[PDB]
Amino acid sequence: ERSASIPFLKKPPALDGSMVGDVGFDPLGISTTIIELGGDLRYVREAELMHGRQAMLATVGFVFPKLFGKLPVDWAKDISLNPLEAQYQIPPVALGQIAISIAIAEGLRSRIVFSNDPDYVVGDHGFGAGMLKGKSEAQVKDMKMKELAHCRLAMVAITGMFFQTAITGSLYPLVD
Amino acid sequence: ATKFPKFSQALAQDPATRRIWYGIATAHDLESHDGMTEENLYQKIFASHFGHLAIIFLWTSGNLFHVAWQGNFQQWVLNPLKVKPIAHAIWDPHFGQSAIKAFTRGGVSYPVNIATSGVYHWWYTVGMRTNEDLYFGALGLLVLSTTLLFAGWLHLQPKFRPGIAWFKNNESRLNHHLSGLFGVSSLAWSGHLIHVAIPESRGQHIRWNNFTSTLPHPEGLTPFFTGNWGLYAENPDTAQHIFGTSEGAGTAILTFLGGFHPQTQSMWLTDIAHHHLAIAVVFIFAGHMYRTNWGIGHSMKEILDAHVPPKGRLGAGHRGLFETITDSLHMQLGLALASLGVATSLVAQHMYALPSYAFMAKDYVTQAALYTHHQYIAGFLMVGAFAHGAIFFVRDYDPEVNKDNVLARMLQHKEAIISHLSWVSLFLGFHTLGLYIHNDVCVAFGTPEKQILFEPVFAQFIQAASGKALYGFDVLLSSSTSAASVASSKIWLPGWMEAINSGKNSLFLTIGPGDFLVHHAIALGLHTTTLILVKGALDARGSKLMPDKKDFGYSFPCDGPGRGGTCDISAWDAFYLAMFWMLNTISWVTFYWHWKHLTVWGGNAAAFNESSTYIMGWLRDYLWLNSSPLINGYNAFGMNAQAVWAWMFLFGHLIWATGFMFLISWRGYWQELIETLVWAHERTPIANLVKWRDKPVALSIVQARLVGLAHFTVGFIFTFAPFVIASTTGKFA
Amino acid sequence: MSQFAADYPWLAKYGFGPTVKAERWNGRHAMFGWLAILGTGVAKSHGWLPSGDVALTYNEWGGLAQQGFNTYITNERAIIMIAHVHALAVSAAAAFGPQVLGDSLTLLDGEKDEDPYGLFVPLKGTFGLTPAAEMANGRMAMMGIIAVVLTSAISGKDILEVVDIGTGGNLL
Amino acid sequence: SASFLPSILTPVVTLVFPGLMFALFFVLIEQEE
Amino acid sequence: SHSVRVYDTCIGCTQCVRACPCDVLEMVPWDGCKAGQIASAPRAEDCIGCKRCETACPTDFLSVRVYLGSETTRSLGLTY
Amino acid sequence: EAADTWWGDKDYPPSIVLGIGKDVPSSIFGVTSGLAFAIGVYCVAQSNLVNILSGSTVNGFYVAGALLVPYSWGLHVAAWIQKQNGK
Amino acid sequence: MITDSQIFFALCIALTAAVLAIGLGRQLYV
Ligand code: CLA
Ligand code: CLA
Ligand code: CLA
Ligand code: CLA
Ligand SMILES: CCCCCC(=O)OC\C(C=C=C1C(C)(C)C[C@H](OC(C)=O)C[C@@]1(C)O)=C/C=C/C(C)=C/C=C/C=C(C)/C=C/C=C(\C)C(=O)C[C@@]12O[C@]1(C)C[C@@H](O)CC2(C)C
Ligand SMILES: CCCCCC(=O)OC\C(C=C=C1C(C)(C)C[C@H](OC(C)=O)C[C@@]1(C)O)=C/C=C/C(C)=C/C=C/C=C(C)/C=C/C=C(\C)C(=O)C[C@@]12O[C@]1(C)C[C@@H](O)CC2(C)C
Ligand SMILES: CC1=C(C#C/C(C)=C/C=C/C(C)=C/C=C/C=C(C)/C=C/C=C(C)/C=C/[C@@]23O[C@]2(C)C[C@@H](O)CC3(C)C)C(C)(C)C[C@H](O)C1
Ligand SMILES: CC1=C(C#C/C(C)=C/C=C/C(C)=C/C=C/C=C(C)/C=C/C=C(C)/C=C/[C@@]23O[C@]2(C)C[C@@H](O)CC3(C)C)C(C)(C)C[C@H](O)C1
Ligand SMILES: CC1=C(/C=C/C(C)=C/C=C/C(C)=C/C=C/C=C(C)/C=C/C=C(C)/C=C/C2=C(C)CCCC2(C)C)C(C)(C)CCC1
Ligand code: SF4
């Protein structure tokens, strides 16, 4: 009847449990207007998952060049602070390799995602399988819940970092 | 099957060449294809919308890229009044030497086309100053077209195809369109103007690297938040501004001076941003109207069902109109084309009346071409709206749903409507042709003083009421110490009066008896085209000659030679007949505009004022006189840069002429000719081993009418465009 | 493969598309074009005959004179273009001629495309004029063309002179 | 050097592309079940 | 092939059958009129669509109706 | 869906055409119609009795009060609708 | 002045747009 997240709001009828992180948080009813189109929540969960994974890698990448240091190789004269202003000093003879690697990875992932197949667990790209063998469904569910919690936390974190370094000089508790 | 019309089993079994023609001609008719449901139809239309939008943005990106690569934007910015804008470079292995030297113009050293679309002025106003900016805009639109193509591919996927209930969500779609697509886009354009285009007009260089740290106003969000919004209007650009530089500039971002910038002869850039901000707020409020998910808002069904006058004045009111509009895509499309045709005719009037782009109203060639462009497109959209209304009547109108409706009563008294349109058209044609022939005979007999010249006092009174003060009417805005003249006297009046009372603008051109006569001709054309289209739409469902016309469809050849003869009886034939009348009235409008502006730009408005009252004056002073630079583009003594316009002039003549083939000669003659040619090929040696797969037949009757009409229209456009470009280019005034 | 066979059945019937016949033919063309690139390097080295400073006048070449940006087409580019046109005419005569002594460009009536597969195509034990070794040579030639194009584009040097880095004193 | 692109692309596109499209379209027209 | 229909306003005056140049129409027995016959179209695949039957009908808004449809080698009247 | 709002067989529309104000009696509608008309005419008269200026004299309270003139039209129409309905 | 690398980048983007246009047209299909 009523959602477990917003107790004074109705429960989103599309969010009927049986999914990681389903705490009934959908005040806009995005998932309501997805299933009445005849779709499901596989694509939006996949988008949330890789958004969060890129968010975690981003949180490490904002802090690492100034807190620890740069690469020992040359051409690393980019600004240690201001990663958002350090995007523009990257030489093209590294951007080519970066773009090619991301292009082939996302081509393989696009072949995975857009195919049709119903046996594809959302997020199970096969890159990470070295630690989930011999585990019950509760352990896998807890591990995926930890992944989703880290996803949402890291996305809020990177939004904070980008809106801090652009307006304010830098992050307060760690930089400057 | 494997045959080409996979969507029509009837066409695939046609053993003749008619199969190919009808498969090409009926490819987009998604309602009549084999095994088509409503949901699949809506999904295919959504994907086609995405593809067409991608085509639009690819075309715009191509314009940007060609001006950036092969253009002279760098040279044109430094001197806009003397440097010819460049469309693109010419590659032709057919050119001779003298054609290469003749087309080598502008600052460049290669053969080149001079742009007549006005894209240089438009980009120059909105802050473009270098070729890199145009190239980056081209890249952005290329990426946008790529994204739209991927979205169109994505929404045909099985998990991403929207349902039929999503498409018929009128309240949500109109809320989102009215708020977002209109108001938020207008607000973003006002933001772009204030942040980039206004500082670029004042000499500042604002781009993607410094816009987030440069304040568009010296205070910045303090007058907005405190409520002192009039601080944004103080210190405007003085009337010595010099566009692109900083002398005499101001620090105002939202003003309503009104009128024109004195140097560029265009409206103030601060007026446009203020206008866009106001339109943004109004459209967001208007999009806050219909109930979607939160209780508040209207239901469109209840508004339509409620609007019934108390005692049967309009029948059952608008009951049942909600069900007919949502379930018929032809009625929605017809309303959309009618509104868009009105809109593009409005832009045609207002872009010459009130120019907004800097250093236009002095090129005169872009000024002519844009007006003729938008007027012809307006005529096309106007004819298409009535055509789709006829299609809606044929195969989407439900008489039991519309019982005693406001729409069924239109069919109830259709004879009165057609007869009164007939009366208005006959009256207007009789009288304006009689006045024109009277003036012809009076001028021919050596007595021009016997002409019937009616002074257009109503439109002159309107011009006086807007502020024009040479007619001496002394009313409203033209007279000071009036309520209208006092109430606005300190907001927008002084700029408007200094712009309307000068002789250098196109604001409210001085009009005489020739304007009266040609306005009556324009009204004749509009009423007769409306006559043909309305008669076709209302008699689409049947008439006395054919009471069961709805059973035969929207387009069919005839009903035979019986009961008198039934040539051109369908509503499609009414469209085909009204196409000629639309072309005629648009030609009248563009002739009037072009000759009036040709006389005004040359400082010789007396020539128009004296020669526009009779037909021979038109024939010998506009068409015969202004064709001399056009037809002399190439001759026996050489050629110049207008040789391409002369060639295209003859080209349009020939296409317009070969339309008369299909329009006057009909199938039988050609079918017998084809049969003789079939015998010839079958009974000659060597060549009879080559055998056709599709049996050659003559073109069908409706196909022939379409082909002749398309020929007529293409020849019409391709013989008017070179004249309206080369005659203005061949005179520079 | 079967994805492209289902996607383009008319195109995959005649052996066009990502097939072994196409890749073998492209490898052979890459081999001959590597030989042609080396020959043009020798042509700029010795200066056998063509000079690339003079122009092509209109009075002797028509509209195939000044074409790009009112810029002259040179005699060196014209000579190499004429040689390429003659090679293409021989190519058209071989493609649309009698199928004698040759592997066909396309697949004939209902014949299956060959499959020497790929991967690493074992060089030892396949020496001589064998299809696997010629296949390997053409594959390496195509990769050499790709690498030379990328290296010239990155370095901003001439394509004929970016390989002059990797030779040393050779030809030119 | 961007002075070669007109003379390369304009013949290739304008001549070669629609000729192949006309041949392909004609073949797709005349194939049957 | 075109589709030919005969409605119940037939009077059985046989003019459509005589006017037919392709032997499409014929007279079958009936009891709804004074003549005791109604027109029929058993050979509509031989219809060419020239509408000579519709010119020959005397009834107000003709009882025999020909709707133009699919085109074959017979309905096009092709000798080749 | 929606409600049956058609009233072509009756001399007055039903009370449900007023939406959220379908239960307000006619006297409140008429009194608020007169008050809104008076206040709106006063607010728009403060734009011609005093010349409205470029920012100096705009007075957004008079702008917000100027919207009561079209609101006063709807209130006296709704007053008639409730009066015929007996409310 | 627009450099050759910029023109080739635009050509690559147009080629990708062409392949997506072919994909969309064959998703509507014949
Ligand atoms: C705020 C959210 C939003 C926005 C921005 C849009 C935007 C759009 N929708 Mg959309 N839609 C939405 C929500 C939204 N939708 C929702 C919630 C639904 C479901 C209920 C739909 C259902 C829907 C359907 C079913 C379809 C669209 C379509 C479209 C496109 C319209 C075509 C176009 O480009 O016209 C752009 C038009 C304008 C920007 C304004 C034109 C009118 C003015 C008067 C023109 C003149 C202005 C100015 C003078 C121009 C001069 C500029 C310069 C040359 C000087 C457009 C991209 C259609 C489409 O193309 O599909 C891909 C379509 O078929 N939508
Ligand atoms: C110059 C060529 C021309 C002219 C003059 C006309 C004239 C006319 N067309 Mg027309 N038409 C044309 C070309 C032309 N068409 C072409 C090429 C097409 C494409 C096929 C059409 C398609 C078309 C359609 C589809 C329709 C018309 C209609 C009309 C009539 C409009 C009413 C009107 O103006 O009455 C004025 C009458 C005239 C201009 C005819 C001349 C009559 C006399 C000679 C005028 C003399 C002046 C003065 C009164 C003399 C005094 C008389 C004396 C005895 C006292 C009118 C008869 C519409 C119609 O019939 O609606 C009523 C209509 O529905 N036309
Ligand atoms: C729809 C927009 C459009 C139009 C009408 C043109 C027109 C033209 N371009 Mg062009 N071009 C465009 C966009 C466009 N361009 C874009 C976006 C780019 C950036 C990649 C280029 C890059 C470009 C170059 C580099 C060159 C031309 C050249 C030319 C000219 C010769 C034709 C040719 O070889 O084109 C070849 C064009 C391409 C290979 C690029 C593809 C063009 C767009 C992306 C396709 C749009 C298709 C359009 C929607 C129509 C769809 C229906 C169609 C399938 C029938 C001709 C005037 C040549 C020239 O200057 O001659 C003097 C030349 O060398 N173009
Ligand atoms: C818009 C595209 C286009 C282009 C780029 C060309 C290019 C050319 N035309 Mg041409 N033409 C075109 C469209 C085009 N045509 C159309 C639409 C028509 C009909 C109105 C004509 C009618 C026409 C005539 C009547 C003549 C030309 C001639 C020429 C040549 C100019 C003379 C010269 O300097 O070369 C001189 C020519 C050569 C050096 C020979 C070059 C060898 C050929 C052309 C290359 C092989 C191309 C190959 C077969 C293309 C395969 C296409 C297939 C895959 C579909 C040149 C090759 C002239 C010509 O060809 O001279 C004899 C000539 O007399 N054209
Ligand atoms: C090459 C392999 C991949 C390496 C990359 C990597 O990392 O591995 C991926 C991985 C797991 C794994 C695998 C391996 C076992 C490693 C290898 C396997 O491969 C095979 C074949 O075995 C694949 C896989 C997936 O199974 C695990 C990595 C997890 C990661 C990296 C998790 C970071 C969260 C960061 C957060 C939550 C930040 C919060 C930040 C917060 C909450 C803040 O408040 C910050 C902030 O307050 C600050 C400080 C100051 C303020 O002013 C600003 C704010 C307020 C914003
Ligand atoms: C306190 C006052 C007392 C007297 C007034 C009064 O109460 O009478 C009420 C009454 C009769 C009554 C009574 C009953 C209710 C029946 C019973 C009462 O007894 C009770 C309590 O039962 C007694 C009595 C006699 O009162 C009748 C009321 C009639 C009324 C109120 C009629 C308004 C038309 C509005 C129009 C036409 C708007 C046009 C608006 C226009 C043209 C515009 O909007 C232009 C616009 O530019 C504007 C201005 C602003 C812009 O933003 C928008 C645009 C640009 C578009
Ligand atoms: C869910 C929901 C709601 C919601 C929501 C919300 C809040 C959604 C928010 C989603 C959000 C916030 C998604 C962020 C994505 C950002 C990413 C992936 C950034 C990557 C960043 C990258 C890849 C950057 C990499 C850098 O390398 C660069 C570029 C330069 C380097 O020097 C530095 C580093 C390494 C860092 C509603 C609307 C509230 C109600 C509704 O009903 C239900
Ligand atoms: C596996 C896979 C993927 C992939 C992939 C990849 C990496 C595909 C890569 C394909 C690649 C890299 C294809 C190169 C071809 C090079 C050719 C044809 C060179 C020809 C060159 C020829 C024929 C010779 C030409 C000339 O000799 C001529 C005629 C005359 C001379 O004067 C000049 C030269 C010498 C030049 C995705 C993207 C991940 C998606 C999906 O998962 C499928
Ligand atoms: C066939 C059909 C159809 C269509 C139709 C159409 C096409 C129509 C059109 C219509 C139209 C096309 C209309 C128009 C209109 C217009 C108008 C209505 C205008 C108005 C204006 C105004 C109102 C203004 C006023 C003013 C002002 C405000 C300013 C100042 C001055 C003056 C006073 C003038 C449909 C689809 C529906 C369906 C059915 C069938
Ligand atoms: S259309 Fe002609 S052939 Fe057919 S039934 Fe009528 S008269 Fe006979």
Coordinates of N, CA and C in Angstrom, one line a residue, chain B residues 97, chain C residues 54-66 72-75:
Chain B
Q97 N 37.1 27.7 -69.2 CA 38.0 28.6 -68.6 C 37.3 29.9 -68.1
Chain C
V54 N 55.7 21.3 -62.0 CA 54.9 21.9 -63.1 C 53.4 21.5 -63.0
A55 N 52.6 22.1 -63.8 CA 51.1 22.1 -63.6 C 50.5 21.3 -64.8
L56 N 49.2 21.2 -64.7 CA 48.4 20.6 -65.8 C 47.5 21.7 -66.3
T57 N 47.7 22.2 -67.6 CA 47.0 23.3 -68.1 C 45.6 22.8 -68.6
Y58 N 44.7 23.8 -68.7 CA 43.4 23.4 -69.2 C 43.4 23.0 -70.7
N59 N 44.3 23.6 -71.5 CA 44.3 23.5 -72.9 C 44.7 22.1 -73.4
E60 N 45.2 21.3 -72.5 CA 45.6 19.9 -72.8 C 44.9 18.8 -71.9
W61 N 44.1 19.2 -70.9 CA 43.5 18.2 -70.0 C 42.0 18.6 -69.7
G62 N 41.5 19.7 -70.1 CA 40.0 19.9 -69.9 C 39.7 20.2 -68.5
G63 N 38.5 19.8 -68.1 CA 38.0 20.0 -66.7 C 38.7 19.2 -65.7
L64 N 39.6 18.2 -66.1 CA 40.4 17.5 -65.2 C 41.7 18.2 -64.9
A65 N 41.9 19.4 -65.4 CA 42.8 20.4 -64.9 C 42.1 21.1 -63.7
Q66 N 42.6 22.3 -63.4 CA 42.3 23.0 -62.1 C 41.0 22.7 -61.4
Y72 N 46.3 23.9 -59.0 CA 46.8 23.1 -60.1 C 47.0 21.6 -59.7
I73 N 46.7 20.7 -60.6 CA 47.0 19.3 -60.4 C 48.4 19.1 -61.1
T74 N 49.3 18.5 -60.4 CA 50.7 18.4 -60.9 C 50.9 17.2 -61.7
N75 N 52.1 17.1 -62.4 CA 52.4 16.1 -63.4 C 52.7 14.8 -62.6

